[PDB]
Amino acid sequence: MTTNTIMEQEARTAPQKIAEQLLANDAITESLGSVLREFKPKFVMIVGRGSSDHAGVFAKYLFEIEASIPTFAAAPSVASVYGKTLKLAGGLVIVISQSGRSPDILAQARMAKNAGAFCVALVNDETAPIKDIVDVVIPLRAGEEKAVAATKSYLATLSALLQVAAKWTQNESLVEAVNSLPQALQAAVDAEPQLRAGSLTDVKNLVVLGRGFGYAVSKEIALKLKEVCAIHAEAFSSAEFLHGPVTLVEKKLSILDVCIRDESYGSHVEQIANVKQRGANLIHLHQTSADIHPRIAPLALLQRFYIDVAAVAIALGINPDKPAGLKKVTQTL
Amino acid sequence: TTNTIMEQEARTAPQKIAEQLLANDAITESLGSVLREFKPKFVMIVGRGSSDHAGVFAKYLFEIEASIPTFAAAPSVASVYGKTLKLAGGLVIVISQSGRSPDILAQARMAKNAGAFCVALVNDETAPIKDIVDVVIPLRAGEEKAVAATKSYLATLSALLQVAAKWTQNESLVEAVNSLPQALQAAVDAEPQLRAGSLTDVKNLVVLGRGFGYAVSKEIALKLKEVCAIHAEAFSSAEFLHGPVTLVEKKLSILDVCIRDESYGSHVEQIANVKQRGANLIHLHQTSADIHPRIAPLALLQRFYIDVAAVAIALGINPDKPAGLKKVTQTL
Numbered sequence: 066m067t068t069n070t071i072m073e074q075e076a077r078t079a080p081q082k083i084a085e086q087l088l089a090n091d092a093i094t095e096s097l098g099s100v101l102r103e104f105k106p107k108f109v110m111i112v113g114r115g116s117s118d119h120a121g122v123f124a125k126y127l128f129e130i131e132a133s134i135p136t137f138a139a140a141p142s143v144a145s146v147y148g149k150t151l152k153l154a155g156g157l158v159i160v161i162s163q164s165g166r167s168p169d170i171l172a173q174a175r176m177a178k179n180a181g182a183f184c185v186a187l188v189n190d191e192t193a194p195i196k197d198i199v200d201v202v203i204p205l206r207a208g209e210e211k212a213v214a215a216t217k218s219y220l221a222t223l224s225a226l227l228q229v230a231a232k233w234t235q236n237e238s239l240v241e242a243v244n245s246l247p248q249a250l251q252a253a254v255d256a257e258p259q260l261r262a263g264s265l266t267d268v269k270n271l272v273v274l275g276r277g278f279g280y281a282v283s284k285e286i287a288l289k290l291k292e293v294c295a296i297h298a299e300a301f302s303s304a305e306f307l308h309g310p311v312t313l314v315e316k317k318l319s320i321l322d323v324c325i326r327d328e329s330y331g332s333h334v335e336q337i338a339n340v341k342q343r344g345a346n347l348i349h350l351h352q353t354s355a356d357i358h359p360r361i362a363p364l365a366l367l368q369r370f371y372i373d374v375a376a377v378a379i380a381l382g383i384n385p386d387k388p389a390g391l392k393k394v395t396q397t398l
Numbered sequence: 399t400t401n402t403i404m405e406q407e408a409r410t411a412p413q414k415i416a417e418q419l420l421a422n423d424a425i426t427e428s429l430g431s432v433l434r435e436f437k438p439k440f441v442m443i444v445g446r447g448s449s450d451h452a453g454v455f456a457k458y459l460f461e462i463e464a465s466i467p468t469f470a471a472a473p474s475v476a477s478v479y480g481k482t483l484k485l486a487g488g489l490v491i492v493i494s495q496s497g498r499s500p501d502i503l504a505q506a507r508m509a510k511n512a513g514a515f516c517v518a519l520v521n522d523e524t525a526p527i528k529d530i531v532d533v534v535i536p537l538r539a540g541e542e543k544a545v546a547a548t549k550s551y552l553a554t555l556s557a558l559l560q561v562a563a564k565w566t567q568n569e570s571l572v573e574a575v576n577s578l579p580q581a582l583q584a585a586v587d588a589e590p591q592l593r594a595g596s597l598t599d600v601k602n603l604v605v606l607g608r609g610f611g612y613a614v615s616k617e618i619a620l621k622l623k624e625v626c627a628i629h630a631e632a633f634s635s636a637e638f639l640h641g642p643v644t645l646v647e648k649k650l651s652i653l654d655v656c657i658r659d660e661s662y663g664s665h666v667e668q669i670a671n672v673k674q675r676g677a678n679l680i681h682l683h684q685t686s687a688d689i690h691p692r693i694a695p696l697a698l699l700q701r702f703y704i705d706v707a708a709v710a711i712a713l714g715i716n717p718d719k720p721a722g723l724k725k726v727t728q729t730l
């Protein structure tokens with residue numbers, strides 16, 4: 066252990082907290098799976114903000130590939146600004162929020178409920194008012210997240226999503242992934258650090274490249290780089306990065322590679338090799354063990370990153386548990 | 399007033415779109431009736447680059463005017479993971495200027511096999527996409543020779559607006575579409591809004607917008623990277639306060655996309671907040687305050703394309719052939 070930050074401490078508790086969540090939520094997720102197999106959602110909409118939006122992106126890849134059901138993030142403004150009600154009959158809406166207090170999220174949830182959608186909430190604060198809007202609540206059980214930059218609550222969200230998907234689809238491979246998840250996270254905590262501040266010193270802008278599930282995690286990494294290091298980081302698809310943004314490479318760009326060993330490995334590696342040939346300076350992040358389930362590695366890579374980024378934060382003089390001008394509960398419309 | 403191909407193409411947009419809307423009236427009328435019969439449960443937009451940002455615009459357009467959930471597809475599910483989805487009863491719109499990238503043809507194929515209704519907004523009418531989808535809506539922008547798209551993006555948004563007008567039959571959208579050419583020409587004739595001096599020595603900036611303004615902010619950020627080599631990133635003014643605002647405690651350059659629609663009040667309040675937190679702001683307003691609110695973003699973008707070609711040339715970048723970029727990019 067290096068920094069004395071609340072963030073690192075919370076990150077290191079994530080594996081046990083996730084184990085406890087899967088135990089406590091096995092029954093509720095079994096029942097949600099049985100409800101969903103009968104209901105047959107036409108689509109899945111994800112309401113979030115912050116790291117809960119990035120979690121929504123992960124859920125998109127998860128449910129499209131494992132459940133074959135189109136999944137997307139909602140745009141709060143349609144409800145909260147334009148006062149519009151969408152046609153959501155027969156759709157599944159999942160509200161994601163550690164705090165469950167933001168007005169625009171609560172407005173979207175309420176509108177979705179009024180539209181006849183089935184509404185599921187992944188919440189960490191059981192006392193949040195979201196519980197009075199949604200149909201079923203799945204508690205994240207991460208306990209209170211005191212640092213401003215989320216760690217344990219994000220991992221708890223992805224595990225809840227994975228567990229819901231495992232129970233719903235009953236794909237035994239996904240079931241195996243969720244069952245192995247606590248051990249893969251613990252292994253990730255115990256591995257050697259992967260990211261160090263020295264690689265980032267004098268870097269004010271960055272591009273994070275990933276593919277598929279790796280892209281979903283990349284969105285969260287760029288946020289933490291912005292949130293706790295004041296580095297303008299941006300997440301891209303390694304496929305979509307070559308449709309315009311690669312010109313930034315020619316201006317000496319610093320790219321962080323989220324290499325996840327799932328079925329998008331060969332394409333991602335080939336795209337990264339192309340970008341390398343185009344002259345970029347690459348920092349490679351990877352899952353900590355090559356003996357992890359392809360669906361669980363995204364989370365293993367994130368565990369290591371959260372611990373190592375707390376130290377990069379402290380090294381750059383930023384306090385990751387109280388970043389400048391930020392709050393744990395952020396409220397917008 | 400540079401002699402770049404980008405600027406020449408950008409300045410033809412009002413006339414090209416005027417011809418397009420008339421030429422596409424019959425096909426969009428029929429598509430409208432078909433969609434009113436079909437009753438799509440959702441809309442899925444397949445694109446990459448400026449065709450994705452156009453997809454974001456389509457999301458706001460169809461959700462607010464048609465109450466139908468709209469979202470961008472993830473190509474990789476089909477192309478990299480080889481997975482298919484259940485799209486029976488859904489509308490799929492493939493948007494692509496070239497219509498040739500393998501990742502979008504793969505997604506289009508999978509969507510068609512899943513029973514989705516497939517519409518293509520394409521500029522090359524001799525492109526593979528026409529052999530997959532159920533209907534092609536020609537963008538009619540003419541040949542786009544510069545690498546950074548201008549007329550073809552506005553033509554995409556005009557086609558989307560016309561399709562929405564025909565489907566919903568909302569009298570307001572009909573008035574907006576009829577007024578579109580005049581608003582684009584007015585935007586071209588207006589005073590420049592973005593000047594190179596504001597960008598000198600700026601390597602990274604954030605474009606903040608809300609609703610339709612956000613959809614256009616994504617395109618603006620893309621053009622700033624592709625054409626000024628500036629690491630620009632677009633955010634919702636609501637979503638910026640959930641993390642990235644820490645970047646404002648460092649001196650950070652923010653481009654304000656200010657649309658006068660239902661979003662105006664909240665967005666302005668967010669822009670004022672970031673200003674108080676010390677950001678350095680460059681304001682991009684609509685060029686006329688009597689333009690229809692649903693076509694205001696196109697007028698602002700129209701002005702931006704002309705201004706940004708000159709910013710590029712002033713920044714020493716050739717906007718017609720950016721460093722290491724082709725007009726047709728294929729990634730799978």
Ligand SMILES: N[C@@H](CO)[C@@H](O)[C@H](O)[C@H](O)COP(=O)(O)O
Binds near residue numbers: 116162170641
């Ligand atoms: N604290 C930030 C994450 O590190 C922030 O982006 C946060 O996730 C956002 O405000 C959403 O919070 P919620 O999940 O409690 O709704």
Ligand SMILES: N[C@@H](CO)[C@@H](O)[C@H](O)[C@H](O)COP(=O)(O)O
Binds near residue numbers: 139
């Ligand atoms: N889908 C995300 C972008 O990739 C998200 O930031 C999105 O822009 C946001 O949901 C928009 O919210 P708004 O409509 O309330 O601005």
Ligand SMILES: N[C@@H](CO)[C@@H](O)[C@H](O)[C@H](O)COP(=O)(O)O
Binds near residue numbers: 276305
């Ligand atoms: N929705 C967009 C991001 O805001 C889009 O660029 C997206 O990231 C892309 O379509 C993902 O492509 P992939 O599934 O092939 O990685």
Ligand SMILES: N[C@@H](CO)[C@@H](O)[C@H](O)[C@H](O)COP(=O)(O)O
Binds near residue numbers: 495496545624726
């Ligand atoms: N030409 C670029 C935009 O100016 C690029 O981002 C482009 O939009 C992308 O490669 C997709 O091309 P398409 O629209 O022809 O499919």
Ligand SMILES: [Mg+2]
Binds near residue numbers: 444447449494495502
């Ligand atoms: Mg495309």
Ligand SMILES: [Mg+2]
Binds near residue numbers: 607612633
């Ligand atoms: Mg927005």
